Ligand code: HEM
């Protein structure tokens with residue numbers, strides 16, 4: 001576990017994009033407030049591993065807006081940082097009724113005919129995720145960010161989901177409209 005108190009002093013450079021409490025400004029910048037600590041810590045290592053200046057291809061998660069930013073932080077530092085954001089309360093967004101209806105259907109039922117499972121098993125009914133298992137909280141996240149992740153998983157641009165490649169196999173059955181409907185519904189999910 002991490003020391004949130006210590007962690008809040010190690011986040012200066014983060015605030016411009018993620019906000020001081022992790023409740024991001026720009027839609028393309030993922031909110032980190034109230035996200036699970038295990039998931040956060042995991043993304044911090046994947047990001048540090050993949051976004052390091054001379055990083056090898058396909059290792060970790062490459063985030064170019066964060067190149068070499070986590071390199072001087074130790075793993076304990078990352079723990080305090082994850083404990084810091086994780087303890088922040090998340091803001092909720094708005095789900096457009098126009099899209100929410102198809103998003104909810106896809107979220108709760110998946111696409112049985114495609115053999116695509118619903119999202120509720122791993123991300124919980126209200127999108128709060130499963131911290132102990134490391135399944136990310138999804139509710140209230142910026143739609144543009146969620147849409148991008150879903151697209152990335154599908155195009156194989158994000159690969160830090162393991163050997164089971166849980167999200168790449170799920171996302172592979174999603175259409176652009178699906179993703180748009182899902183990302184919008186999840187943004188108002190709370
Ligand atoms: C500062 C040291 C810092 C931290 C901490 C941080 C964390 C972080 C995480 C945990 C993610 C993943 C979130 C998730 O998976 O839900 C992530 C992703 C992005 N970040 Fe970040 N981030 C820090 C700093 C910054 C700064 C200063 C910027 C903006 C210039 C930035 C931006 C982004 C972007 C963009 C992503 C998402 C990338 C994508 O998948 O499209 N980060 N951050």
Ligand code: HEM
Nearest residue numbers: 117118119122134135136146149150160161166167170182
């Ligand atoms: C259902 C169609 C579905 C959605 C929607 C969904 C989305 C989703 C997103 C957008 C992420 C990234 C979150 C972030 O960057 O903050 C993501 C990541 C993971 N998911 Fe998922 N997910 C859906 C379904 C499922 C199912 C059925 C499972 C469990 C079998 C699951 C699990 C996970 C895991 C694990 C991750 C984390 C990947 C990592 O980098 O560690 N999802 N999901």
